[PDB]
Amino acid sequence: SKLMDKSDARHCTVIHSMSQNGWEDFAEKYDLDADDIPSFQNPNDWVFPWL
Amino acid sequence: KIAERQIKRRRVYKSIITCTAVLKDKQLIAGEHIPIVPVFGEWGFVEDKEVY
Amino acid sequence: NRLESILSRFDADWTASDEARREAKNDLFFSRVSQWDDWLSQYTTLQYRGQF
C-alpha cells in the first residue's frame, strides 16, 4: 500500500490480545471452541517487568 | 380517618453521656438529620482514613 | 462453581491492574498525606525531613 489511508491494501491483519475470560467471551461471540487456546505472533514485548 | 399507611422517615435522638453513665437516654430531636453541619476544606480519603 | 469463577475473574483483573493501582495509590499518598514515602529508613535514624 502506497497511500496514507491504506486504501490500496488488499489485506490487513489485526492482532487481538485478550484475557482468559475474554477468550471464552470471544469464542462464545464468534462460535469458536474455547478449549483450543489460540496463539499468534506476540505484538508486545516484555521490556518492562510487568508482573 | 380515611385509612392508614406506612411511611419511612428518619428520627434523630440525642443522649447526654459520660464515661460512667448516661444521664439522658434517647431524647427525641425535632430535626430529621443530625443538626451539626460540617464545613471542610481540602477534604478527601487516601487510605480509607479521613484527611482534611 | 460460581465462587471459583468470580474469584478467578477478580484475581485476573487485580493482577492486570496491580501496577496501575500501586502508582495511583502512591500519587494519592504523595499529594494527600506526605511526600516522604520512606517506610523502612523512617525509623532507623532521626534526621530532618522537610516538607517544601
DSSP assignment of A27-46, as one string?
HHHHT--TTS-------S--
A46 vs C contacts (CB less than 8 Å): none
A21 vs C contacts (CB less than 8 Å): 8-9, 12
The grid cell for B39 is 464545613
Q: How far apart are CA B51 and CA B38, in angstroms?
A: 14
Alpha carbon C26 to its chain's center: 5
Write the CA distances from A32 to A20, A26, A38, integer angstroms. 14, 8, 11
Grouping H, G, I as helix, E, B as strand and the rest as coil, residue B45 is strand
The coordinates were experimentally obtained by: cryo-EM
Contact C15 A51 (CB under 8 A): yes
Which residue type does B5 have? R
Q: How far is C29 from chain B (nearest CA, A)?
A: 6
The residues pairing with B12 across neighbouring beta strands, listed in sequence order, are: B29
Burial class for C12, CB neighbours closer than 10 Å (0-12, 13-18, 19+) = middle
Resolution in Å equals 3.2
C33 vs B contacts (CB less than 8 Å): 46-47, 51
